[PDB]
Write a protein that binds this DNA or RNA. Sequence first.
RNA 1: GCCAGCCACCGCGGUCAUACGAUUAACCCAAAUUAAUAGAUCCACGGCGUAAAGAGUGUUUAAGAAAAAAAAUCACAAUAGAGUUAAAUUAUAACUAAGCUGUAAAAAGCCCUAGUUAAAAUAAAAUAACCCACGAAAGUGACUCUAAUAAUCCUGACACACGAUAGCUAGGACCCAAACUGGGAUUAGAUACCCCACUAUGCCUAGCCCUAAACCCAAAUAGUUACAUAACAAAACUAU
Lengths: 99, 52, 97, 135, 96, 57, 86
Amino acid sequence: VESFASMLRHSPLTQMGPAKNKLVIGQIFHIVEDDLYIDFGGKFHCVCKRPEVDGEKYQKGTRVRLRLLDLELTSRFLGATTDTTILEADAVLLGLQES
Amino acid sequence: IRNYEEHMQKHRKDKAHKRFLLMSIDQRKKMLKNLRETNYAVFEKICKELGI
Amino acid sequence: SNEDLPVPMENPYKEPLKKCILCEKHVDYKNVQLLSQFISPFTGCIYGRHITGLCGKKQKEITKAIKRAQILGFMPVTYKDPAYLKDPKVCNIKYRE
Amino acid sequence: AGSRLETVGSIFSRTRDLIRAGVLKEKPLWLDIYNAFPPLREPVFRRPRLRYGKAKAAVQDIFYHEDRIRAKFYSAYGSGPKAFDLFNPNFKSTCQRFVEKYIELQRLGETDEEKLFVEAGKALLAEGVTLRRVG
Amino acid sequence: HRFMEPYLFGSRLGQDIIDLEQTAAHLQLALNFTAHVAYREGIILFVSRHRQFAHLIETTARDCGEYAHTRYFKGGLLTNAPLLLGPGVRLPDLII
Amino acid sequence: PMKGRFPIRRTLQYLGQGDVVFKDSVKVMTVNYNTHGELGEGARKFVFFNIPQIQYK
Amino acid sequence: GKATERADAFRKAKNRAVHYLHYIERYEDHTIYHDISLKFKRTHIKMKKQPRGYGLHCHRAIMTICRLIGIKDLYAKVSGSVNMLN
RNA sequence: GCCAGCCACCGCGGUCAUACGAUUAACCCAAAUUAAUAGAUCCACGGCGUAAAGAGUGUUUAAGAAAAAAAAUCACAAUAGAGUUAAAUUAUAACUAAGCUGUAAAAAGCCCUAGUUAAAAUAAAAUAACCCACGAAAGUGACUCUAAUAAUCCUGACACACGAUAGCUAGGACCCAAACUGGGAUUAGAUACCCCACUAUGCCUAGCCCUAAACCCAAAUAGUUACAUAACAAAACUAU
Ligand code: FES
Ligand SMILES: [K+]
Ligand SMILES: [Mg+2]
Ligand SMILES: [Mg+2]
Ligand SMILES: [Mg+2]
Ligand SMILES: [Mg+2]
Ligand SMILES: [Mg+2]
Ligand SMILES: [Mg+2]
Ligand SMILES: [Mg+2]
Ligand SMILES: [Mg+2]
Ligand SMILES: [Mg+2]
Ligand SMILES: [Mg+2]
Ligand SMILES: [Mg+2]
Ligand SMILES: [Mg+2]
Ligand SMILES: [Mg+2]
Ligand SMILES: [Mg+2]
Ligand SMILES: [Mg+2]
Ligand SMILES: [Mg+2]
Ligand SMILES: [Mg+2]
Ligand SMILES: [Mg+2]
Ligand SMILES: [Mg+2]
Ligand SMILES: [Mg+2]
Ligand SMILES: [Mg+2]
Ligand SMILES: [Mg+2]
Ligand SMILES: [Mg+2]
Ligand SMILES: [Mg+2]
Ligand SMILES: [Mg+2]
Ligand SMILES: [Mg+2]
Ligand SMILES: [Mg+2]
Ligand SMILES: [Mg+2]
Ligand SMILES: [Mg+2]
Ligand SMILES: [Mg+2]
Ligand SMILES: [Mg+2]
Ligand SMILES: [Mg+2]
């Protein structure tokens, strides 16, 4: 039996370090007309817009490359006891995964 | 205290320093009473040398 | 006996605090060019923190340095000196739209 | 009929008291399960007071000696050319490989950080990975 | 949240990490308690007001043969049951 | 009693439960103690607790 | 229970009363276990334990509640506001 | 039938009074009953943002606390002197113009005026300031220089020192603002709001007066986030 402490040390999330400016690949799980819901393995799902080039090949299950900036967008405003989360993540598209 | 008195003789209408001069005297007066009730021999020498 | 527990150490990823434009630099009332860049050329007003962007220490020093030059006779009061009108722009205010 | 007060106590506390009182003559089915299997904490209502003063939270930060090594690698070389993949439980990152070889190298008796950092970069270069220095 | 402090293993760069060791102990009793009430022919209701898994949770209860309520919750449903549902209604014996 | 650090010591029972009766030849008792230092703990607590009991009798 | 008519007011109060029920522990079914001192809002009420012989020396509203609960020996003093609801 | 009258407190009576007067009946004390005046008893080991309550401020004396730990501060507009002037305005001069000020709309006033150019004195201190510093408080933010901000770091008065603005006494200054006063307009009246003129005075030196919503309506020194929501507001509380 492996202790839970050892699992966190070798987990990919811990090895990433700060979430800012990290190249993380993700898989698309939902498609809208212009919005691509991408799961990059984090707690929440980032949303990006379909690029104008090679946009027809962005389908469900396709793998893409992302640049994580904030793992979970969250800010504090005056008069709020608890921060108001957005239930999403911030990322940008660098293209499609090079298989 | 000597420095404030020299300042007071020039600037007579100054009130911030006049309060400081009075408070400085009171603190020295309080401390002299404390010294007298603990070490009389030193208090007598301090009183004579400084002219207080 | 478990060596996998986290240790009580400070954050190693603490990015250095941002430096202002004039940090570690000595402002003066004799160099008009340095003082003139923070003055509106059309009116002669002094920009605030939200426009100048300087920190809390060099903003006051610039204000005192500028006013010393106003009276001592080193820079105009109601307008920016035209000789230093082509200096690089450091403020974040735009008049032309 | 029953008790509808949330703040008096847990559901177990009110149910057994009413049965003992004699008003509820039909024992609920879930009560027997609760007696056999009680939870870790009894569900007692408590007001979420806001913390004032010098009191802070007891949560400790998750930091490791590896993180200190990872900071130097990220500061110098930035993010590695390899793309991180969180879907693989056994993924080995480029920074993780650098840390693992850093630990092995320092087991040889080297104390200077500069020697450990420079040699580790040279060792990774022998494996074929790219370590283009930033700036 | 203040009451979640004991259940947090720690915070990683501002992100809290839940201690799974305490989760396993709680989940073991949760599944054990859930099965026993279902063994005794008890009504189990799945409640989740989240508009990303409403269909998945609703289908989950249908396979198990139990009831689910992932829609908008009326004010007097569980309390004022006779008026909302019917004259004689048997209240659920467990809510998930 | 509500006010005070130890309101119990200001009731009749506490003043009456102290049994220390001086002889007829004792007239003056002088107590000297310090307000600082761990050595004076016994003296300060004696003044704070037992002296009212001694004076009452 | 509040309504436009007094007769309807009594009916609502009775039915809604059985929904809110407490269980008060009674030491030997005649007295509370220990003396209780509480300050609810702006009402100071102090209750003391008593033996079997001397019982039910309390506020006339407290006596009505005590006879319903089952307590038969109690002393209670009410200070401050004497509002019935508090 | 708000009449005659009743009440310990709240109240009753204004042509259908269980409250006045009488009657029937009832209740409660009883050789006593009721009324009147004294007395027993009864206020705070409770409170001080909004309720009566933290006194305008600081130091010190009398007095009292100390008991565990620990603590001389600080870029910036304190204060009092000395020197200095950018932007505006005015005396005043030149030139042009016949009008200029003013309001929701006008009148009155001015025409010794208005615009431009040149320019002392007095007075007041744009932007910086979306900063929050200094002083015990009231206060202070144009520039320069000098002097300078008590206590080896508790509480403390009726005592000592201080205290915006208005007001008084004497001398000096007067751009401009301006109670009072006069004129215009409005209005039923307007000894008001609005418009024009001007005085005390706002300013400097010396003295006095010692009042403010002197309010952050929250006293000083050490602390705690435990217990716990009257209401509202600026969450609750312990020790001296
Ligand atoms: S941040 Fe260093 S002087 Fe401005
Ligand atoms: K100025
Ligand atoms: Mg009453
Ligand atoms: Mg009568
Ligand atoms: Mg009649
Ligand atoms: Mg009567
Ligand atoms: Mg009668
Ligand atoms: Mg008051
Ligand atoms: Mg008050
Ligand atoms: Mg006071
Ligand atoms: Mg005082
Ligand atoms: Mg003394
Ligand atoms: Mg002067
Ligand atoms: Mg003149
Ligand atoms: Mg005219
Ligand atoms: Mg003119
Ligand atoms: Mg200010
Ligand atoms: Mg002070
Ligand atoms: Mg000081
Ligand atoms: Mg003192
Ligand atoms: Mg005065
Ligand atoms: Mg004055
Ligand atoms: Mg005056
Ligand atoms: Mg006079
Ligand atoms: Mg005069
Ligand atoms: Mg005048
Ligand atoms: Mg005038
Ligand atoms: Mg008139
Ligand atoms: Mg004030
Ligand atoms: Mg006051
Ligand atoms: Mg005060
Ligand atoms: Mg005081
Ligand atoms: Mg002090
Ligand atoms: Mg304090």
